Design an enzyme around this catalytic site. Structure first.
Site, PDB file in Angstrom:
ATOM      1  CG  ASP A 137      -2.066   1.003   1.043  1.00 19.82           C
ATOM      2  OD1 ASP A 137      -2.590   1.144  -0.088  1.00 19.82           O
ATOM      3  OD2 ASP A 137      -2.415   1.667   2.043  1.00 19.82           O
ATOM      4  CG  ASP A 169       2.104  -1.846   6.385  1.00 21.89           C
ATOM      5  OD1 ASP A 169       1.791  -1.831   5.160  1.00 21.89           O
ATOM      6  OD2 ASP A 169       1.499  -2.566   7.215  1.00 21.89           O
ATOM      7  NE  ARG A 207      -4.763   8.867   2.517  1.00 27.05           N
ATOM      8  CZ  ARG A 207      -5.965   9.295   2.912  1.00 27.05           C
ATOM      9  NH1 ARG A 207      -6.594   8.734   3.937  1.00 27.05           N
ATOM     10  NH2 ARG A 207      -6.554  10.282   2.250  1.00 27.05           N
ATOM     11  CG  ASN A 208       0.057   4.392   3.721  1.00 27.66           C
ATOM     12  OD1 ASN A 208      -0.605   4.757   4.705  1.00 27.66           O
ATOM     13  ND2 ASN A 208      -0.421   3.556   2.811  1.00 27.66           N
TER      14      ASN A 208
HETATM   15  C1  LIG Z   1       4.777   2.215  12.872  1.00 28.26           C
HETATM   16  O1  LIG Z   1       4.543   3.577  13.036  1.00 28.26           O
HETATM   17  C2  LIG Z   1       3.285   3.883  12.773  1.00 28.26           C
HETATM   18  O2  LIG Z   1       2.516   3.073  12.433  1.00 28.26           O
HETATM   19  C3  LIG Z   1       2.968   5.334  12.834  1.00 28.26           C
HETATM   20  C4  LIG Z   1       1.729   5.792  12.421  1.00 28.26           C
HETATM   21  C5  LIG Z   1       1.405   7.132  12.428  1.00 28.26           C
HETATM   22  C6  LIG Z   1       2.338   8.037  12.825  1.00 28.26           C
HETATM   23  C7  LIG Z   1       3.577   7.592  13.237  1.00 28.26           C
HETATM   24  C8  LIG Z   1       3.924   6.263  13.252  1.00 28.26           C
HETATM   25  N1  LIG Z   1       4.355   8.635  13.593  1.00 28.26           N
HETATM   26  C9  LIG Z   1       3.714   9.803  13.482  1.00 28.26           C
HETATM   27  O3  LIG Z   1       4.144  10.843  13.717  1.00 28.26           O
HETATM   28  C10 LIG Z   1       2.360   9.490  12.956  1.00 28.26           C
HETATM   29  C11 LIG Z   1       1.487  10.479  12.708  1.00 28.26           C
HETATM   30  N2  LIG Z   1       1.770  11.791  12.910  1.00 28.26           N
HETATM   31  C12 LIG Z   1       1.150  12.984  12.768  1.00 28.26           C
HETATM   32  C13 LIG Z   1       2.023  13.991  12.849  1.00 28.26           C
HETATM   33  C14 LIG Z   1       1.631  15.298  12.729  1.00 28.26           C
HETATM   34  C15 LIG Z   1       0.331  15.677  12.510  1.00 28.26           C
HETATM   35  N3  LIG Z   1       0.049  17.066  12.417  1.00 28.26           N
HETATM   36  C16 LIG Z   1       0.355  17.799  11.210  1.00 28.26           C
HETATM   37  C17 LIG Z   1      -0.418  17.780  13.485  1.00 28.26           C
HETATM   38  O4  LIG Z   1      -0.739  18.926  13.383  1.00 28.26           O
HETATM   39  C18 LIG Z   1      -0.415  17.068  14.842  1.00 28.26           C
HETATM   40  N4  LIG Z   1       0.070  17.933  15.901  1.00 28.26           N
HETATM   41  C19 LIG Z   1      -0.732  17.769  17.100  1.00 28.26           C
HETATM   42  C20 LIG Z   1      -0.426  18.819  18.154  1.00 28.26           C
HETATM   43  N5  LIG Z   1       0.984  18.846  18.461  1.00 28.26           N
HETATM   44  C21 LIG Z   1       1.252  20.036  19.228  1.00 28.26           C
HETATM   45  C22 LIG Z   1       1.817  18.840  17.268  1.00 28.26           C
HETATM   46  C23 LIG Z   1       1.443  17.751  16.270  1.00 28.26           C
HETATM   47  C24 LIG Z   1      -0.586  14.652  12.396  1.00 28.26           C
HETATM   48  C25 LIG Z   1      -0.160  13.328  12.520  1.00 28.26           C
HETATM   49  C26 LIG Z   1       0.154  10.166  12.216  1.00 28.26           C
HETATM   50  C27 LIG Z   1      -0.700   9.480  13.043  1.00 28.26           C
HETATM   51  C28 LIG Z   1      -1.963   9.166  12.642  1.00 28.26           C
HETATM   52  C29 LIG Z   1      -2.390   9.549  11.400  1.00 28.26           C
HETATM   53  C30 LIG Z   1      -1.548  10.268  10.590  1.00 28.26           C
HETATM   54  C31 LIG Z   1      -0.282  10.583  10.986  1.00 28.26           C
END
Ligand SMILES: COC(=O)c1ccc2c(c1)NC(=O)/C2=C(\Nc1ccc(N(C)C(=O)CN2CCN(C)CC2)cc1)c1ccccc1
Length: 291
Positions: A152, A170, A156-157
């Site tokens: 996949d 993943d 997005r991933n």
């Molecule tokens: C095996 O590893 C994994 O499976 C795994 C999976 C997901 C993530 C990960 C590891 N590692 C990350 O960082 C992940 C995400 N990261 C994220 C980062 C930043 C944001 N953004 C742009 C924000 O604005 C969030 N914001 C919140 C408030 N504080 C102050 C600052 C950060 C949103 C998601 C994320 C998780 C869920 C869906 C989408 C992405």
């Protein structure tokens, strides 16, 4: 399932302080968190924690513990999302602590930079885009070497952290439709190789097809593949016969040639990720050449 080296991986729950969810899904959630000393220095690092939801079936617990084990199997690389530690011992929830990538997924990020792009000179440039592309190739060459198949591979991933480092993840149909907006979803079929649409078979060279679609996403600055076209059984038909997407608005000719190479109808005639890494590094080094 497999043995688990707690010396190497177990992190104390009392050095983890959970914050707000980064995302919540069908099978679990990812929480933003602070970890004290997870990298062996005397520092607080923001990490991301995969854990279960409050419902939580024994099948959902077994799956996370399988993902933890597979992460330990893959091992470390700069361009995958790495396991930092785990909390698996009696006294609390199962938590898989992984790298935090502060800029989020790459698709959304690129779409957000459309009025902040210039081919060459704050802004995104071709250099950034071929960089992200080379880095995902380097990431995927690594996973091929661990005998993984991603299944996949899409922008997005791919997550973006500090210093324009980009990392393969993943992991919608899930999320509450009251809250669902315009790009909150993606149709995976648009990333599948003809042999996978049709015969449902995944190989590392079908991942090379999706890498081509990912390239297209990078060089459209986060647009959706196959613009306009509806994805019916004749889409498929045409795809298996030679129809391919047009060059996106931000591609170079060499990059579009590379998409088309990755979309070879014949799996064995697609470049390997090792060949993509070599070729894309050349393109990257050419791009920043002088007079
Ligand atoms: C095996 O590893 C994994 O499976 C795994 C999976 C997901 C993530 C990960 C590891 N590692 C990350 O960082 C992940 C995400 N990261 C994220 C980062 C930043 C944001 N953004 C742009 C924000 O604005 C969030 N914001 C919140 C408030 N504080 C102050 C600052 C950060 C949103 C998601 C994320 C998780 C869920 C869906 C989408 C992405």
């Amino acid at each position: 399932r497999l043995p688990y080296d707690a010396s190497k991986w177990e992190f104390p729950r009392d050095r983890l302080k959970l914050g707000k969810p980064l995302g919540r899904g069908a099978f679990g959630q990812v929480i933003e968190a602070d970890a004290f000393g997870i990298d062996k220095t005397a520092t607080c690092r923001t990490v991301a924690v995969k854990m279960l939801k409050e419902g939580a079936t024994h099948s959902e617990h077994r799956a996370l513990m399988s993902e933890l084990k597979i992460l330990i199997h893959i091992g470390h690389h700069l361009n995958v999302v790495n396991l930092l530690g785990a909390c698996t011992k009696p006294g609390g929830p199962l938590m898989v602590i992984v790298e935090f990538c502060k800029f989020g997924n790459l698709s959304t990020y690129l779409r957000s930079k459309r009025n902040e792009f210039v081919p060459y000179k704050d802004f995104l440039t071709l250099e950034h885009l071929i960089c992200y592309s080379f880095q995902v190739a380097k990431g995927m060459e690594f996973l091929a070497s661990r005998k993984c198949i991603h299944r996949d591979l899409a922008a997005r991933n791919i997550l973006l952290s500090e210093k324009n480092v980009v990392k393969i993840c993943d992991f919608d149909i899930y999320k509450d439709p009251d809250y669902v907006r315009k790009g909150d979803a993606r149709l995976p079929l648009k990333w599948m190789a003809p042999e996978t649409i049709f015969d449902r078979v995944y190989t590392i060279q079908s991942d090379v097809w999706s890498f081509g679609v990912l390239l297209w996403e990078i060089f459209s600055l986060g647009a959706s593949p196959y613009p306009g076209v509806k994805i019916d059984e004749e889409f498929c038909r045409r795809l298996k016969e030679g129809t391919r997407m047009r060059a996106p608005d931000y591609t170079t000719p060499e990059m579009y040639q590379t998409m088309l190479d990755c979309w070879h109808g014949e799996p064995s005639q697609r470049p390997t990720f090792s060949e993509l890494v070599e070729h894309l590094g050349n393109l990257l080094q050419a791009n920043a050449q002088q007079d």
